[PDB]
Amino acid sequence: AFKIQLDTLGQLPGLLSIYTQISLLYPVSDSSQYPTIVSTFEQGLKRFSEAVPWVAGQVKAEGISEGNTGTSFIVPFEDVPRVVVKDLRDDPSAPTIEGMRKAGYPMAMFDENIIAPRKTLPIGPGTGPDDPKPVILLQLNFIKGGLILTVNGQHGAMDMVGQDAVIRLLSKACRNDPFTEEEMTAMNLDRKTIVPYLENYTIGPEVDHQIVKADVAGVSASWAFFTFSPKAMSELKDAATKTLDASTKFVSTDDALSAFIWKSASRVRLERIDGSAPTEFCRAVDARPAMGVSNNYPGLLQNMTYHNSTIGEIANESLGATASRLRSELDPASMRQRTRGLATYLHNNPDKSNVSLTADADPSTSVMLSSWAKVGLWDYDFGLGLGKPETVRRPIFEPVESLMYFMPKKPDGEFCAALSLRDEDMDRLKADKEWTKYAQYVG
Ligand SMILES: C=C(C)CC(=O)O[C@H]1C[C@@]2(COC(C)=O)[C@@H](C=C1C)O[C@@H]1[C@H](O)[C@@H](OC(C)=O)[C@@]2(C)[C@]12CO2
């Protein structure tokens, strides 16, 4: 038995209704290999569950009433995490290894309805509040010449850093490799106390842009992957580094690409709105380092940084000026104070319904980006004997205007950005020469 209160940050209403999906593609030389793939994977899930029982649990809310959004806990569910096995080898609507390779692994070929065990959003059958919310769900998809492994994580229970930590240990378990003491410790840290609260706190700048207000706001669209070569990435960082603000010593590769996207989106948006239009960049940031928490902590410990300007200013300023905006918010002391503030506000409020990481983001003019660039998914083989993933891609789901992801970085340095934009923005972006100089459309 177990009853593990979610991270206070994981009590965010938005996170409690969402599943984060990621797919790993492996080539499979011969269909003779599938039975052992499945048994190895099932045995791994069993071993993992025996070692860390809560991974087989579910997220369950209690104490809900009028003006009380309740408190969720990880509690028992089934003996092992659920894996679904789907054979798509003979399905003419399914992807194939050669189709994937020819098209460069587009998002459209990772259809969540076909290759994921549950949808990202609370849409359709089995996504109601009374329906179970398993902590993790897995799907093994056999495709012609390949295997797609998809992992869903309940977002209240884990951010992608936590999900990566869970998946990493699942790979060990599949191989029958032992967990380290530090791994076992990280997997079992108490969550409800992991962010120390602020004393006598009501409301401060810490929760700016995170509480919905009635006088503050916060279309045909699509998803597409764009790739950026290692050379494109280094040239973007070079361009930014040459043009930094005086207050900024350095920026990162991730900063530079993030800035380039904000600038490029803002540029194409000038074709439909005025340069004076406000624009907010919302950037997901792992709060573990600022909090002094292990990278192996499997929970939800994330915040955003917010950057407000105008469409014209962002479009027209140097790349370094834009990258400097992003880097300026990553001071550990600032991240810690802000994150403690958000956690404290949540803790102090039985009604959490007004709190949102994108509370004042306007989908028309904002960018909401989460970078998974630094997660370790490219390294896991799960004892399957297939080698490392050929690609690591997020499944396509409903378009969500201005939502964006960076995939885990390909070992050679290649980046893959998933962008969701309204059609007129997407079309203009794809035809924009300043964008296509660096960005290769995949789809
Ligand atoms: C459409 C949903 C109903 C709300 C939404 O935009 O969710 C995004 C953003 C986000 C969660 O959104 C909210 C409002 O909490 C998450 C997943 C999804 C589907 O991805 C990314 C990430 O996992 C979340 O951010 C965190 C956890 O800090 C998130 C903010 C994101 C863009 O950064």
Side-chain angles (χ1 to χ4, degrees), residues 424-432 434-436:
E424 63 187 293
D425 287 357
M426 187 74 79
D427 293 334
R428 288 182 171 120
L429 194 65
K430 288 165 62 181
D432 181 293
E434 288 175 282
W435 171 259
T436 63

Side-chain angles (χ1 to χ4, degrees), residues 16 19 57-61 75-78 82 118 125-129 131-132 134-135 137 154:
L16 285 176
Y19 278 83
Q58 64 179 304
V59 173
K60 192 135 194 69
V75 296
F77 180 48
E78 293 179 349
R82 291 174 169 185
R118 176 159 176 163
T127 63
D131 296 314
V135 166
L137 292 167
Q154 211 303 115

